[PDB]
Design a binder for this molecule. Structure first.
Ligand SMILES: Oc1c(Cl)cc(Cl)cc1-c1[nH]c(Br)c(Br)c1Br
Ligand SMILES: [Mg+2]
Length: 776
């Protein structure tokens, strides 16, 4: 058995490597150690010192040099006995403290053990290198194994969710948290791969295509939805909830992707060193010379949308090659060759739109002296160029009921062009998702495991509305963790009156959430909205308004003294300063109807669908106005979260090792920040101090049969029959607890002590068979 064979890749790649005779000498030492800060200023840089003496309330210890230092036992971070180094579940540590927990993660990390359990949930420290642990061989190992049986792995957390779906007939979710680049998306992929493989169909082998189409749906989105940021070379610029769908039997019956909050602005702007969406570079570098001809393509550096960041390629990525992967993913999903070429027309069209140069005419309004870019765009889109031109520079609006032709300046014309671009891109992306969803979902699900892959927390020199939305989302995901680990958990203990004294885990980012999406009193999004449909409002009246509501009034809010255009929100993962510029327009998300008119007329079957389909091109009307982006997204998010509350959540906490995207460099301050703000220690603490597993009194007749005074699945009393099978082995009384309608087990008694009763090789047929058919 590979898991027991020290030779296996399993053992080689997933297990702590065997310590040597020298390590054994140290492991049996009677010496004790403490984690301390050599520099009290740098509280996240720790050294190990030896405890040399102790008083009633103090330890004295040697620093890395020979100096002696004293500390209150109350304030001491004791080092766990080294036998614990590498331990797979940190709820097992004797001492649960920051340097201890970080140290354990460090030991596992140093030998490419990136997964470690922390009580109920999984921690995943990004390796930033490939590790051979996701082969079909690895899947196989994990198929069906109990969490305690196999090493920590994304596959194991996935299998558990799967088993729990089947055993409880309840929908599950894999919530994968992390700041940008921490590993959310790679782990999402593994979750799907694994589920796809473990619950996929062979059936004589000619129908498994559904599962290949599920797998293939993600490389498509990734090419249109991902881009290099300063924080991640493959940053997800949209969030996604993936439903993997199962039939009654337990097999995969389909999948459905809900996408969130595509970063439309990236298409027309990217900050230094960053990249537009992969698709633009893939196209340009991977098109046939004849496609380059039909689309009037040329190099990255020929396009304003691709040539401002100073970066057109990503180290170790071939765009020409990724392009082949995308095309193949589009084939496998079912995108017809016309559909695909339309898609690249739209991509090519966007690039040309970007090259349109507006200039000042005689008057104040703009003029288009060189129509090269305009014509190439219209050609590719199949729209009338002089109609598009007039729609760009001279859109018509109502003025009362009068029809008036605008003459936009250079600045307004450029912006409107950008708006057309972002609408184009955003609708295309939404279409791609719609197309995929329709291919994958062809069976009424019986159950699902939802996999959440959002854009992770991020901070840049300049943070705009997109970031506020991203970090608010991450803020809510974390509160969801807070809620299930601590709030719901204890509230239960209270209900069941199991004599639990409430603990405040000091983790609640509700105030921050409220500050953002609060209705009454109104939060940022509400004021943004109010201001968005106030006809005279500016970015400036907006920040003034925000300042007036929250400055020195909201503890999570800050009006900076160094700027008039920025406001600070204190998030769980840190304070973020947000630049107000353009918020109103971003929230209104306006597009001249003359542009829409111009494109509804496109001769292209895909472009026309982007503009004529009400489920793609239509906008919800919030009374007299269109629904704002803020309101719409608050609404999508609440819905997601409402769906999540109905599932049984499993948490994977991804952790970025550093900010350099380097393997083998675990930066303690970086990791500890995440460990703190994730509430990792608090999550371990609740699982240790508490009673995770609790079954109703009635159904307690479940794994427990005559392993004590004769008592089969029957009994007339419920609170009596309970204490029965337990006392036989005399299993510790304070190691469990009797509540109103349930029986709780401290830190998993079903596994800890229950290893003779259940999980045995005897106790079934061996203790019955001594005198079968031979008793005289
Ligand atoms: O309809 C839009 C318009 Cl008119 C302007 C802009 Cl900037 C974006 C979208 C958009 N983006 C995404 Br993603 C979806 Br779905 C939609 Br609709
Ligand atoms: Mg991602």
């Amino acid at each position: 058995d590979p898991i027991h064979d020290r030779t296996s890749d399993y053992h080689k790649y997933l297990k702590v490597k065997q310590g040597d005779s020298d390590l054994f000498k140290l492991t049996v030492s009677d010496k004790r150690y403490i984690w301390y800060n050599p520099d009290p200023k740098e509280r996240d840089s720790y050294e190990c010192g030896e405890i040399v003496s102790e008083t009633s309330d103090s330890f004295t210890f040697k620093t890395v040099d020979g100096q002696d230092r004293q500390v209150k036992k109350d304030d001491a971070n004791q080092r766990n006995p080294i036998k614990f180094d590498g331990v797979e579940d940190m709820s097992e540590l004797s001492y649960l403290n920051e340097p201890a927990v970080f140290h354990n993660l460090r030991v596992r990390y140093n030998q490419d053990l990136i997964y470690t359990y922390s009580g109920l949930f999984l921690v995943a420290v990004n390796p930033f290198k490939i590790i051979p642990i996701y082969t079909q061989e690895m899947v196989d190992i994990f198929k069906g194994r109990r969490r305690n049986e196999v090493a920590p792995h994304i596959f194991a957390i996935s299998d558990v969710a799967y088993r729990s779906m089947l055993d409880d007939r309840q929908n599950q979710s894999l919530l994968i948290t992390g700041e940008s680049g921490a590993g959310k998306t790679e782990n999402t992929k593994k979750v799907i791969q694994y589920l796809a493989s473990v619950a996929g169909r062979n059936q004589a082998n000619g129908s498994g295509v559904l599962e290949q189409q599920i797998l293939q749906a993600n490389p498509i989105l990734e090419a249109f939805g991902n881009a290099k940021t300063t924080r991640n070379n493959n940053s997800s610029r949209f969030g996604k909830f993936i439903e993997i769908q199962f039939n009654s039997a337990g097999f995969i019956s389909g999948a459905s992707i809900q996408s969130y909050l595509l970063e439309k602005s990236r298409v027309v702007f990217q900050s230094e060193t960053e990249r537009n969406y992969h698709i633009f570079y893939q196209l340009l570098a991977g098109a046939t010379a004849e496609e380059k001809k039909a689309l009037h393509l040329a190099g990255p550096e020929s396009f304003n949308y691709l040539n401002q960041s100073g970066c057109v390629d990503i180290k170790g990525v071939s765009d020409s090659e990724e392009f082949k992967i995308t095309r193949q993913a589009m084939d496998i999903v079912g995108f017809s060759q016309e559909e695909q070429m339309s898609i690249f027309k739209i991509i090519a069209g966007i690039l040309h739109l970007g090259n349109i140069k507006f200039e000042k005419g005689a008057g104040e309004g703009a003029v288009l002296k060189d129509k090269t870019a305009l014509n190439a765009a219209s050609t590719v889109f199949g729209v009338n160029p002089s109609v598009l031109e007039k729609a760009l520079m001279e859109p018509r609006i109502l003025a009362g009921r009068d029809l008036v032709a605008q003459h936009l300046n250079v600045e307004k014309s450029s912006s409107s062009r950008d708006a057309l671009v972002k609408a184009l891109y955003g609708r295309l992306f939404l279409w791609l998702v719609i197309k995929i969803n329709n291919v994958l979902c062809q069976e009424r699900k019986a159950y699902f495991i939802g996999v959440l892959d959002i854009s992770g927390f991020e901070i840049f020199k300049v943070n705009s509305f997109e970031q506020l939305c991203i970090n608010y989302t991450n803020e809510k995901l974390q509160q969801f963790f807070n809620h299930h680990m601590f709030k719901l958990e204890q509230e239960e203990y209270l209900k069941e009156k199991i004599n639990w004294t409430f603990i405040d885990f000091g983790l609640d980012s509700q105030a921050t959430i409220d500050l953002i999406d609060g209705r009454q009193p109104p939060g940022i999004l509400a004021l943004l909205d109010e201001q968005s449909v106030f006809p005279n409002a500016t970015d400036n009246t907006l920040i003034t308004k925000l300042h007036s509501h929250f400055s020195k009034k909201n503890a999570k809010y800050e009006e900076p003294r160094f700027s008039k255009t920025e406001f600070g929100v204190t998030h769980y993962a840190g304070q973020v300063m947000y630049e107000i510029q353009d918020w109103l327009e971003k929230n209104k998300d306006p597009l001249q109807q003359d542009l829409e008119l111009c494109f509804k007329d496109s001769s292209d079957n895909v472009v026309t669908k982007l503009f004529n389909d009400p489920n793609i091109a239509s906008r919800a009307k919030k009374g007299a106005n269109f629904i704002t982006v803020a309101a719409q997204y608050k609404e999508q998010l609440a819905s997601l979260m409402a769906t999540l509350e109905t599932t049984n959540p499993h948490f994977v906490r991804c952790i970025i090792p550093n900010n350099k995207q380097l393997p083998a460099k675990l930066e303690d301050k970086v990791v500890l920040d995440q460990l703190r703000c994730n509430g990792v220690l608090e999550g371990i603490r609740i699982t240790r101090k508490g009673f995770p597993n609790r079954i109703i009194y009635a159904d307690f007749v479940k794994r427990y049969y005559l392993l004590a005074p004769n008592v089969p699945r029957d009994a007339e009393d419920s609170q009596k029959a309970t204490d029965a099978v337990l006392k036989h082995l005399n299993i510790d009384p304070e190691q469990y607890r009797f509540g109103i309608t349930k029986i709780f087990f401290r830190a998993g008694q079903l596994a800890r002590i229950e290893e003779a009763r259940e999980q045995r090789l005897e106790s079934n047929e061996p203790p019955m068979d001594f005198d079968d058919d031979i008793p005289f």
